[PDB]
Amino acid sequence: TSVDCTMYICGDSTECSNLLLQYGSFCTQLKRALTGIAVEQDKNTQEVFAQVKQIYKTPPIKYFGGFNFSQILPDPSKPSKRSPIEDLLFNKVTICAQKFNGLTVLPPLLTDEMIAQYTSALLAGTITSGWTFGAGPALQIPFPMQMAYRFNGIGVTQNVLYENQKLIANQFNSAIGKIQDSLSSTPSALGKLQDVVNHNAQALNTLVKQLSSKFGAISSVLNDILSRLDPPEAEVQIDRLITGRLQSLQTYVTQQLIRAAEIRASANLAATKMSECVLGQSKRVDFCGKGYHLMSFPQSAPHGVVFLHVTYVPAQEKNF
């Protein structure tokens, strides 16, 4: 977002700007802070998503050992090059007057199609090249080889996977198919992004409602005071209106900074999970899912990301 420090405080009256010139050195700092948050928010998605400098594409045929990946790879039939999971997320996640009072929003530098391409390249690299593409040149590896090598990373011998890959593929397909109705059953989890939107959306809404306020003045409307009063006594209302609107702006800017700090912290954590849980097999407990971790897949979302952690757990036990 961006704001104009004159249009918000004052209408089309030069005298309000003249009395604003008494302070002067406030909204320059406000604009500098706002554009700092804007460029930081533009920067934030770049190291989260754009981590590979070589965009890949999937091969046409899919001899993926019986594993089904049609839910996560982009569908060419849909005009938007996205995945059905991404379509579900876009459907489950839901103005000009806000744009018309000196407050503007700015489009992101990266659109949805380019970040979709980045994610598609990420799945292509993590499917057909293993995890070697996060270090240097990508080296192609068949998917059962990669699955056995991930089984080897949790203290399990590789013969188990080659012995039971049919059951592994069936379990993977069933678990993948469960996740669509798991997401569509309740909108609670997607609330983790909804609070990002409406708290922002109400943030200007409680500000734009503060225009119609008698901040010790006769009226919130400005020009009728000039048309009614006599100019040497108009200042005693103009100054208190100006100071009240300045306090509202200061509070809004401070609250935006407070939100942006923890948003940047969450973005840094998401970048870390992109680095470790996706491009490798992290051995940290509970960090990349629940139980022993095998892999993870990224999916885009409106102003966010979602990880699908593929993990492994034991089922039955016997005493000896």
Partner 1 sequence: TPCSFGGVSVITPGTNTSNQVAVLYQGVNCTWRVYSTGSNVFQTRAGCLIGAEYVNNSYECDIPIGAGICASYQQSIIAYTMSLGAENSVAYSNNSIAIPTNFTISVTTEILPVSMTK
Partner 2 sequence: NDILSRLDPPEAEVQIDRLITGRLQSLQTYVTQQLIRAAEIRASANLAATKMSECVLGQSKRVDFCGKGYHLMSFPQSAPHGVVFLHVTYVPAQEKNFTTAPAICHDGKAHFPREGVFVSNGTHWFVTQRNFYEPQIITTDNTFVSGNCDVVIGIVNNTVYDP
Partner 3 sequence: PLSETKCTLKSFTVEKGIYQTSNFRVQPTESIVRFPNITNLCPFHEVF
Q: Is 251 in the site for partner 2 (CB under 8 A)?
A: no
Distance CA 150, CA 153 (A): 5
- If binding means CB under 8 A, how many residues of this protein chain bind partner 3? 4
Q: By rule CB under 8 A, what string of x and - marks binding of each residue 35-54 to partner 3?
A: x-------------------
Q: Is 272 in the site for partner 3 (CB under 8 A)?
A: no
The site partner of 165 among its own copies, partner 3, partner 2, none (C-beta below 5 to 8 Å per kind) is partner 2
Cα angle, residue 257 at apex, residues 256 and 259 outer, rounded to 5°: 65
The site partner of 4 among partner 2, partner 3, its own copies, none (C-beta below 5 to 8 Å per kind) is partner 3
Q: Is 257 in the site for partner 2 (CB under 8 A)?
A: yes
DSSP output for 243-293: HHHHHHHHHHHHHHHHHHHHHHHHHHHHHHHIIIIITS---STTTTSSSEE
Q: Is 56 in the site for partner 1 (CB under 8 A)?
A: yes
Residue 178 contacts by C-beta under 8 Å, 6 or more apart in sequence?
A: none
Residue type, 16: C
| Residue of the chain from 104, 247, 250, 254 that contacts partner 1 (CB under 8 A) | 104
The site partner of 315 among its own copies, partner 2, partner 1, none (C-beta below 5 to 8 Å per kind) is none
Q: Is 106 in the site for partner 3 (CB under 8 A)?
A: no
- CB atoms near residue 293 (< 10 Å): 24
3-state secondary structure of 302: coil
Distance CA 78, CA 113 (A): 13
| Residue of the chain from 28, 40, 57, 163 that contacts partner 1 (CB under 8 A) | 57
Residues in 22-51 at the binding interface with partner 1, rule: CB under 8 A: 42, 50
3-state secondary structure of 312: strand
| Residue of the chain from 128, 146, 299, 300 that contacts partner 1 (CB under 8 A) | 128
Q: By rule CB under 8 A, what string of x and - marks binding of each residue 140-179 to partner 2?
A: --x-xx--xx-------xxx--xx-x--------------
Distance CA 1, CA 3 (A): 7
Q: Are 19 and 10 in contact (CB under 8 A)?
A: no
Please give the DSSP secondary-structure letter assigned to residue 74: P
Q: Is 137 in the site for partner 2 (CB under 8 A)?
A: yes
Q: Is 13 in the site for partner 2 (CB under 8 A)?
A: no
CB of 311 to partner 1, least distance (A): 25
Q: Are 309 and 286 in contact (CB under 8 A)?
A: no
Cα angle, residue 116 at apex, residues 171 and 72 outer, rounded to 5°: 10
The site partner of 106 among partner 2, partner 1, its own copies, none (C-beta below 5 to 8 Å per kind) is partner 1
The contact set with its own copies (CB under 8 A) reads 22-25, 28-29, 206, 209-210, 213-216, 244, 251
3-state secondary structure of 146: helix
Q: Is 7 in the site for partner 3 (CB under 8 A)?
A: yes
Residues of this chain that interact with partner 1 (CB under 8 A) are 2, 4, 7, 42, 50, 52-57, 59, 63, 96, 99-100, 102, 104, 106-111, 113-114, 117-118, 128-129, 137-142
